[PDB]
Design a protein around this ligand. Structure first.
Ligand SMILES: Nc1ncnc2c1ncn2[C@@H]1O[C@H](COP(=O)(O)OP(=O)(O)OP(=O)(O)O)[C@@H](O)[C@H]1O
Ligand SMILES: Nc1ncnc2c1ncn2[C@@H]1O[C@H](COP(=O)(O)OP(=O)(O)O)[C@@H](O)[C@H]1O
Ligand SMILES: [Mg+2]
Ligand SMILES: [Mg+2]
Lengths: 110, 485, 472
């Protein structure tokens, strides 16, 4: 945990919270973690042979067949836009702490 | 954990991307589990680029890597004298460990602007064509550029052999230790070279650094730099050193190889952008030190290999700009019988007469200028027109001076033997002799003085100059010999 | 348990193999793949990472399917060594290709091995008489030394070697190793005929030479390793047997050429001219192994190809430094009809020294060069003005020069089917006296034609007399 990296999820799920996709964005984010642990993935999520806008397309295959698509079909391109798919697992962790602050930050009148 | 260690991610072509090592320095030495050492040149967050000093068939993915904590250095001191070491400074001649006095880094800052002295000390190369036209000076770097199979190494080699005249002496400030740096050459040749040095008892004051082609590219690249530190040693302890690089042309090819393989963008002809900075921070390391520093000095004889006689090339121009002149050698002159084939037209010395011996300075003043006139007249008589007394007179002498400059390899001539010959040339005592006679004339004339007029040779040697009296006797000694036979 | 893997990519002569196990085979190792046609051998090149490796095919990769199973060998490509290889044609892989049964050898060493130590280096200055005028007079070869035969296409590099084998291999006494790297498959067959007829290689009897081929028809991987295969066999007789060996290679250029085809696919940044960055090293490791050591002597005759007749090309230009003798052929000389088209000027050797070939031999040679040189320096004038404008002294040197040049030619027994003239073998002793006699001006009366394609100096005067009867 740090802040800037943790804000990525909070700045993407922030909109998700308004809807309540924390489950579709927190459970999905968990996927990005396993994808990095995948040896075969390391040769694709960090391969400078693909491109800047090409590799982003192949991502959809791991975004429409993993869990992503909604609150993760944006963070996916962003996570692989600059190349932050090395220490991204740290961003997902913050989501678990930021996803719990959204429950209290709501008009609890009922 | 990974601060002092790392795991290899990829390896091939002498390159190894290791992961970890977040406390290793720039250009720091490292050691793999295999035993093979390596050098870190590219520092990146993801991985570290390292170059291998040995084969890479031993490194494999996931291997452990350890650091040395120290910048790649080499043993230095008198001990190396007569020994043959490699880039790193390890013995390769098989004659025991290297007994060094200190250890200095590969990359050393060039001497200061303040601690310098103008070059005034000559460097007897034993080559008449050289010591008369383009003299060498303790503290300068005289290039030896030319095509393959011309005589580049020759010039250098004979120089070392000539130093035997003073290294066997007692005086230190007069001696001159030699450092040959073989780079790109085959072990066969190096072996034969070192054999030749011994055949002349020249190995005792000579240090050799071997970086044959077979070795890894990083060795050939580091070879010159480490070798320079070896020589710098004398420079600092108030002694004189003479390093010869042969050749920087190969070194750049080697250094080009690390760049391309480390995926570093090429400049022109694939050479790294800073390819200039490769030879600049090398040659500048040799210079004459201040009296406060020790009056020490380091002379450099860089060697370059042109293609098809094209000096307009990328690497050669880079070095011509740094060196204090160059001894151009043409293949075409070699066959014509000019050996060594030194083109005076293009060979110059920036230090000039300052470095030349005072005695030899007198006997040959406008000699280089005269040889320029000769080629001017030689080209103009091509027309096939008759020549008057003037254009033929200079043509007669100019043609013989060129024949007097021809000297056999492995045959260095003292100063006391060069002065007399040049004397009889610039004046005009050879004009009345046939061209195919100049040959034996040299040997005969020398034997004449060593037998009769030997006193004069002894004065020229010690004094190193020509007095009003010495000229008189020398004048009469010449004319007397011409009359003989 | 045999280590096994699966293919992940197949681009040309480059196949990427992946291993599930956490144990990966080192570099320079072999691999095998089961096929209906036989077995395809691979060679590790570099570890791309992620338990994936990059390898170089040894044969055609047609039919290879992604994910196919790949078996590991456990050692770098090895080849049988010993007297058992003699009289047998070995393939790049190290298997018989002459259909005469498997080579039952005692030991089998790998093609990859480190170059001799500096202390192991042994130098020699012994002359080697070939019988070739333009050589034994100008750039004589040395015993157990390195020989190089540069030249463009169709200049006479092989035909030059063939003669060397017809004159040295016979009266040698040791062993020989011929290795055709990237050459006409046809020349190999005809070479086989010659070895049989001459009796150098007797099927029923014994033989004096081993035949290793990696012809151009074979893919790049093979054209790259073949040179190593042939060399491994010869270094055996050098250390193990410690006997004189003649190593004939043709052509050595294919070695770097074959490596520059794959360097691109390997993912290397092309150096200038397209050649791979590591040209100097690779070529280095090869030449450093082909040398004489304190255990045995080896005389190597390597032929080098010159792309677009350019000697400044990085390939040949890095070859000169690895040779004790260099004999360059210029197509500008062969077109004149002069053969061999040796260029006396460019040709160099290490034996051209009076302290070896004798003082007189040194002087005669030098005079020949100067004379030839003076003819070249006036060539520009000749085409423009002519000899009429040449001075008396210059005009005499030209004719004499032109006489010396034509005299350099020599009928080759191997090339008799081209010249229609029986071979002519000339001794070094007679050659020196011959030119020396021409320099003295003792044959300025004889016409130039009488010097063309002539063997012995006696044959010159003989041929001059025959031309008198033909004049009508
Ligand atoms: N002063 C000389 N007189 C006559 N011949 C010479 C002289 N110097 C050198 N040579 C001859 O020239 C040949 C090559 O000389 P040298 O070794 O100097 O060339 P090089 O510049 O070193 O070329 P490379 O760099 O390829 O070795 C040798 O065979 C030698 O005999
Ligand atoms: N000594 C020679 N005399 C005459 N012709 C020769 C000689 N050597 C080679 N040649 C010419 O070369 C041709 C064969 O070329 P080759 O020598 O095989 O060239 P490459 O060096 O490319 O193999 C022949 O037709 C022949 O005329
Ligand atoms: Mg040299
Ligand atoms: Mg051929």
């Amino acid at each position: 945990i740090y802040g800037i990296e943790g804000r990525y999820a909070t700045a993407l799920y922030s909109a998700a919270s308004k809807q309540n996709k924390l489950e579709q964005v927190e459970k999905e984010l968990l996927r990005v973690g396993q994808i990095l642990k995948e040896p075969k993935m390391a040769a694709s999520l960090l391969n400078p042979y693909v491109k800047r806008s090409v590799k982003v397309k192949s991502l959809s295959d791991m975004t429409a067949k993993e869990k992503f698509s909604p609150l993760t079909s944006n963070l996916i391109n962003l996570l692989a836009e600059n190349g932050r798919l090395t220490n991204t697992p740290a961003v997902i962790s913050a989501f678990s702490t930021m996803m719990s602050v959204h429950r209290g930050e709501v008009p609890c009148t009922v | 954990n990974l601060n002092e260690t790392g795991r290899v991610l990829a390896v091939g072509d002498g390159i190894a991307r290791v992961f970890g090592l977040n406390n290793i320095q720039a250009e720091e030495l490292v050691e793999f589990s295999s035993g093979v050492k390596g050098m870190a040149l590219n520092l990146e967050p993801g991985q570290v680029g390292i170059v291998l000093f040995g084969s890479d068939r031993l490194v494999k993915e996931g291997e452990l890597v350890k650091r040395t904590g120290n910048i790649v250095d080499v043993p230095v001191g008198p001990g190396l004298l007569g020994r043959v070491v490699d880039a790193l400074g390890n013995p390769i001649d098989g004659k025991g460990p290297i007994d060094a006095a200190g250890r200095s880094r590969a990359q050393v800052k060039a001497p200061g602007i303040l601690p310098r002295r103008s070059v005034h000390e000559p460097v007897q190369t034993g080559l008449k064509a050289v010591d008369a036209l383009v003299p060498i000076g303790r503290g300068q770097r005289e290039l030896i550029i030319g095509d393959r199979q011309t005589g580049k190494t020759a010039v250098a080699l004979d120089t070392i052999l000539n130093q035997k005249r003073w290294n066997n002496g007692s005086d230190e400030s007069k001696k001159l230790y030699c450092v040959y740096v073989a780079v790109g050459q085959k072990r066969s040749t190096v072996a034969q070279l070192v054999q030749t040095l011994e055949q002349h008892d020249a190995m005792k004051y000579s240090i050799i650094v071997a970086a044959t082609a077979s070795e890894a590219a990083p060795l050939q690249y580091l070879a010159p730099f480490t070798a320079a530190s070896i020589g710098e040693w004398f420079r600092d302890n108030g002694k004189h050193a003479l390093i010869v690089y042969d050749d920087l042309s190969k070194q750049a090819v080697a250094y080009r190889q690390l760049s391309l393989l480390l995926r570093r963008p090429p400049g022109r002809e694939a050479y790294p952008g800073d390819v200039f900075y490769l030879h600049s921070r090398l040659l500048e390391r040799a210079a004459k030190l201040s009296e406060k520093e020790g009056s020490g000095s380091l002379t450099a004889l860089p060697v370059i290999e042109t293609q098809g006689g094209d000096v307009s090339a990328y690497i050669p121009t880079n070095v011509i700009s740094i060196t204090d002149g160059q001894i151009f050698l043409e293949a075409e002159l070699f066959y014509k019988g000019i050996r060594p084939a030194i083109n005076v037209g293009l060979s110059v010395s920036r230090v000039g007469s300052a470095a030349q011996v005072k005695a030899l300075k007198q006997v040959a003043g406008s000699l280089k200028l005269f040889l320029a006139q000769y080629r001017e007249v030689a080209a103009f008589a091509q027309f096939g027109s008759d020549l008057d007394a003037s254009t033929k007179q200079t043509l007669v002498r100019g043609e013989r001076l060129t024949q007097l400059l021809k000297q056999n390899q492995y045959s260095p001539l003292a100063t006391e033997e060069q002065v007399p010959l040049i004397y009889a040339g610039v004046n005009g005592h050879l004009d009345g002799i046939e061209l195919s006679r100049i040959g034996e004339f040299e040997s005969s004339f020398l034997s004449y003085l060593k037998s009769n007029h030997n006193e004069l040779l002894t004065e020229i040697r010690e004094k190193g100059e020509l007095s009003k009296e010495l000229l008189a006797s020398l004048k009469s000694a010449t004319e007397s010999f011409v009359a003989t036979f | 348990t045999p280590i096994t893997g699966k293919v992940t990519a197949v681009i040309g002569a480059i196949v990427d193999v992946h291993f599930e196990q956490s144990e990966l085979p080192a570099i320079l190792n072999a691999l095998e793949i089961k096929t209906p046609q036989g077995k395809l051998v691979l060679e590790v090149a570099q570890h791309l990472g992620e338990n994936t490796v990059r390898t170089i095919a040894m044969d055609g990769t047609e039919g290879l399917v992604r994910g196919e199973k790949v078996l590991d060998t456990g050692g770098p490509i090895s080849v049988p060594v010993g007297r058992e290889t003699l009289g047998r044609i070995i393939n790049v892989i190290g298997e018989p290709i002459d259909e005469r049964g498997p080579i039952k050898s005692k030991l089998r060493k790998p093609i990859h091995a480190d170059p001799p130590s500096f202390a192991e280096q042994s130098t020699s200055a012994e002359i080697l008489e070939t019988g070739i005028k333009v050589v034994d007079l100008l750039a004589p070869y040395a015993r157990g030394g390195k020989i190089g035969l540069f030249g463009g296409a169709g200049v006479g590099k092989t035909v030059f070697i063939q003669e060397l084998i017809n004159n040295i291999a016979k009266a040698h006494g040791g062993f020989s190793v011929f290795t055709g790297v990237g050459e006409r498959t046809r020349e190999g067959n005809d070479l086989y005929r010659e070895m049989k007829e001459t009796g150098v290689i007797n099927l029923e009897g014994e033989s004096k030479v081993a035949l290793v081929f990696g012809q151009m028809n074979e893919p790049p991987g093979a054209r790259a390793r073949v040179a190593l295969t042939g060399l491994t066999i010869a270094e055996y007789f050098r250390d193990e047997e410690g006997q004189d060996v003649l190593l004939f290679i043709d052509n050595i250029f294919r070695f770097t050429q074959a490596g520059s085809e794959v360097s691109a696919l390997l993912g290397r940044i092309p150096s200038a001219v397209g050649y791979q960055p590591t040209l100097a090293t690779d070529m280095g490791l090869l030449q450093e192994r082909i040398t004489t050591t304190k255990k045995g002597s080896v005389t190597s005759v390597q032929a080098v190809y010159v792309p677009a007749d350019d000697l400044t090309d990085p390939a040949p230009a890095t070859t000169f430094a690895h040779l004790d003798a260099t004999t360059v052929l210029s197509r500008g000389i062969s077109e004149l009809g002069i053969y061999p088209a040796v260029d006396p000027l460019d040709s160099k050797s290490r034996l051209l020294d009076a302290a070896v070939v004798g003082q007189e031999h040194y002087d005669v040679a030098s005079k020949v060069q100067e004379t030839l040189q003076t003819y070249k320096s006036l060539q520009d004038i000749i085409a423009i003005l002519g000899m009429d404008e040449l001075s008396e002294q210059d005009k005499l040197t030209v004719e004499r020069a032109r006489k010396i040049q034509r005299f350099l030619s020599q009928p080759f027994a191997v090339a008799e089917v081209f010249t229609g003239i029986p071979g002519k073998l000339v001794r070094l002793k007679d050659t020196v006296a011959s030119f020396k006699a021409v320099l003295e001006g003792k044959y300025d009366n004889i016409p130039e034609h009488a010097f063309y394609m002539v063997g012995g100096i006696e044959d010159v005067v003989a041929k001059a007399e025959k031309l008198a009867a033909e004049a009508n």
